[PDB]
Structures are given as C-alpha cells and as structure tokens.
C-alpha cells in the first residue's frame, strides 16, 4: 500500500515505535480538519451489535472505537455477541477514519462533541454506559466527561478495559515493540496512510494534559498476563485507574483479553451493570 | 500520487514549507539505509551530456545533481548543450533517488564517498570541476572537500550557481512560499514520496555544521533578480560564498537563471575555466 505503512513497519522492526508516532502526529496536522461538530464528514450514527430482551429504563452499552489504525467496525464483534439477549450494545465510530478519506478532528473535544451528538440521538432516553479498550478506554472517559459537562447528559457508568493513562504508561512504553507488532498481526487489509495519520493525531490528543475526572462510576477491567517481559523488581505493570468503582481481572493480556477471553470481559460488565441499578 | 505529496502541497499553501521539510527529514530516518559506499543500491556511473573538442591536461565539468525531489537527469540538459565542443560534461546522480525504491545514505559523507568513487573512476586522468545549482551548490562544495580531505585528489575548481549556505539563508526563509510553489510548478509528473523523503533527508544534512572548507578556486555565479520581494534594508538577498576566486552575475532569478538563461551560466563557466588554465 502506502509509504507511511512502510515507515511504520520499519519503525517496529527497529524498536522505534515511540519515535514514529511522533512523526505520524506531526504529519497529521497537514491533513484537512473539521473545526465544529456538524462539520464532520462521516455520519457518526452508532451501530447495534447486540440487542437486549424486550423489557424499561435499563441502560445501553456504547462501545467507543479505539485509536488503532487497523480498527473499524469489527472491533466489538467478538465482545458484543456476549451481550446478546442482555443489553443493547451500540458501537460508535471514531471521527477521522471513514470511507475517499475523512476530515480529521481539529482538536479532541470537537470529535467527542460530534460523537456525543450521535449517541444522544440513538440512545433516546436510555441511561448510557460507555466502554473502551486500550486507547478507547481513555477516549471513553473523555466522552463521559464531555457528555456530563458540555451536554448535561452524564453517563450511568464507564467501563475501562485496560487503560494506561498519562500517569502510568511505563509498561506500555516498555512493551511498545509488541504493541506495534500487534497492530500488524491484526490486519484485515493494509493499513491506509490516512488512518495511520488519524491514529497519530488521536495519540497526541490523548497523550496531552487532560483535566476533568467524570462523575460516572468507573469499572476497571484489567488483564492478568503481561504483554512482554517485566521484572517483578519494577512494580505493577497492570493497567491503572484512580478510584475504580470496581476492579475486575480477566484472563490473558492486553490483546487476548478482547480476542480469546472476551466473554470474561462481558461477564464482568454484566455483573457490574446490575450491581449499580 | 501518495500521501507525502498531498501533505506537502497542503503545507505550501499554508506557508508551512519549513515545518514540513522537517517532517520529511524525521520521517526519512525510517527508510532503509546504506552505511558504506559499496552498499549503495544504484550504479552511480556518471553520464556524458556534452563532448569536448578533440584537442591532455584539460579539465572536465562534473555536474552535481541537486536536492529537489522534482528533478533527476533532465536537470542539466539546457546547460550542457552550451558545453558541446567546449568541455566534457558528466552528470553524477545523488544516492537515494533510484528506480523499486533506493537506499538512503546513512549520512552525507557516505553519499559523497559513493559519488567521489564513481567520479574518480570516470575522470580518469583529467582534472575535475564540480558544478552545482541551489542545493547542489552546497553539495558540490561538500564533495570537493571530500575528494580533497578523504581521497587525496582535490578538484581543479568549483562552480557554485547561487548557493545560500547555512549562515546566509535569510532570503531562503522570506521566500519559503515562492520556493515551495516553484518546487511544484516544476513537476513533470508527481513527486514520489520516496524522493520527497530523500529531499528532506539531504536538506537536513546540508543545514548541519560542515566546517571543512575546500581549497579549490570557487566561481560564484549569482542571480540578478530577486525571487520574491525583499526589503533592501534587510541586507543583501543575493547568493553568498566566502572568498570566491571569481564572481559572475547572470540574468534571471534563482529559478530562471537555470532554465531561461543557462547560456549565460555556461559562458561564465567557460571564461573562468580558461582564466585558471
Ligand atoms: C491501546 O490502544 C494502546 C496500548 C494505548 O492505550 C496507548 C497508551 C495510547 O496512547 C494509544 C492512543 C496508543 C496508540 C498508538 C494505539 O492506537 C495503540 C493501539 C494498540 C496498542 C491496540 O491494543 C490494538 C487493538
Ligand atoms: C535550492 O535547492 C534551495 C533554495 C536551497 O538551497 C535550500 C536553502 C537548501 O536548504 C535545500 C537543501 C532545500 C531543499 C528543500 C531543496 O532542495 C529546495 C529545492 C527547490 C526549492 C529548488 O530551488 C529547485 C531546484
């Protein structure tokens, strides 16, 4: 395919993943942007992947698609089949990755706003619980804070699947070789350069300083296996959130917890969603 | 073409030529390299573009290909024809702009040594005179110093057509916009991204500290007309070299001196080559 993918592949071989996300981020600024929510090119309509039972005031899960360039609609397919007959599971797309190619959000809040406007429409009046894995975790918490403040529609709760927020990213950096290798592994097609740029831009948004904590109760799903090597001498490699309302450990590592062991993740979510209603 | 050419074109409209030329250099670190002169992918065999008289002590012109990604072999055609029946004129390619796609020099000295080898092997016993325009004048001098210091075989002279060496590029900044637009306006087809990466890598090299100065006599050929506006009380917009053997001015600006008035340039070089013989 494109040259940005050839550079990306070379940077993973050569254990320079970190360096190269900076080039992706810096190059993304010369893509076309959209500056206001309605100026988004993609129809951000959510997509129903599971239905709940025909009852009544229960909450719907909203999956927030992650930053991975090789991500798309299929991200939540394995996970969602375990919410069938349990909860509505809608997956919202992320602005910057669709069909030509798409306008990049000028800044993070513009994209979160465009997302919240589409979730509110499709949610109706159901209470809404947000869900993200990895970079999607960070994203979901920001959308939860952006729904609370900017739109006065605070979510019923947030599920964070293995988040490494800016305080606690040391195990993510150490393992960045595997993270990069995992992106390539999990490829249905050659990653487009348009999406690699999109990925780099959101990587920059989320790396940055971010102020508010969202008042919604947080469920923190952590992996059990480390992604790579890690001397016990060096501390806890597990994902971290500050005052989890509930902590749940599922089998596998940063990657396999949503592939092989996604039913354990849905089991934690179901148990938790009832304990809060 | 590809994504880099799109990003670059966006950047020129937004007077951000400078910042994007630094994305290109950063990005180019992740291309495959060659670290010794032998490991060069291309055959750097020079090319005969003008034949001299059949008369020996007689010096040959060697043209050093510039850094512009929009060029290659056609660069010296208008100039070389005025050397027919006057001087032999070789044109030596720059490593990194070949066929698939070509390996990049680990550093500038690895490229010059690759080129100095193909030039000694072709000059045979003749004195060589290196000739370069814009970025290629910075490359001509750097090669002359390499042929001297490292190969023990200094050239007979250097023809620097309009250099703006590191401490005197204020005109190059003020005119960044015109420069980037002329880069596109000279496309005879889309600029490949591997070549755009090539340009940014060499541009980085040439901004470096290259303290070695050559001992060959230097003909500084200057444009007569400024490329864009310039407030005369800023200093001199003209091209600059320290202590040149000869200064010759020619009609046109930084671009047009080499297209429209390549006859003027060639006559300056022929008069001077005689004076030093
Ligand atoms: C999760 O996606 C990664 C490990 C993550 O949370 C880091 C710390 C964030 O900065 C994101 C924005 C990193 C980017 C580069 C990313 O998209 C990583 C994607 C990989 C690691 C996914 O696990 C693939 C399913
Ligand atoms: C000459 O090539 C340019 C104006 C130049 O010398 C600048 C000051 C150097 O930094 C070079 C290495 C800059 C690169 C980007 C370059 O080759 C630009 C080339 C265009 C604008 C040429 O004028 C076309 C031959």
From Swiss-Prot, chains A, B:
Effect of residue 173 to N: Only relatively minor changes in the thioesterase activity. 10-fold reduction in the kcat/Km for ketoester
Residues that coordinate or bind substrate: 67, 135, 162
Region (Thioesterase): 69-270
Additional detail: Type I modular polyketide synthases (PKSs) catalyze the step-wise condensation of simple carboxylic acid derivatives. Organizationally, type I PKSs are arranged into modules, wherein each module is comprised of a set of catalytic activities that is responsible for a single elongation of the polyketide chain and the appropriate reductive processing of the beta-keto functionality. A minimal elongation module contains an acyl transferase (AT) domain, an acyl-carrier protein (ACP) domain, and a ketosynthase (KS) domain.
Written domain comment of the UniProt record: Cells lacking the TE domain are unable to produce methymycin, neomethymycin, narbomycin and pikromycin.
Function: Involved in the biosynthesis of 12- and 14-membered ring macrolactone antibiotics such as methymycin and neomethymycin, and pikromycin and narbomycin, respectively. Component of the pikromycin PKS which catalyzes the biosynthesis of both precursors 10-deoxymethynolide (12-membered ring macrolactone) and narbonolide (14-membered ring macrolactone).
Protein's UniProt name: Pikromycin polyketide synthase component PikAIV
Organism: Streptomyces venezuelae
Gene: pikAIV
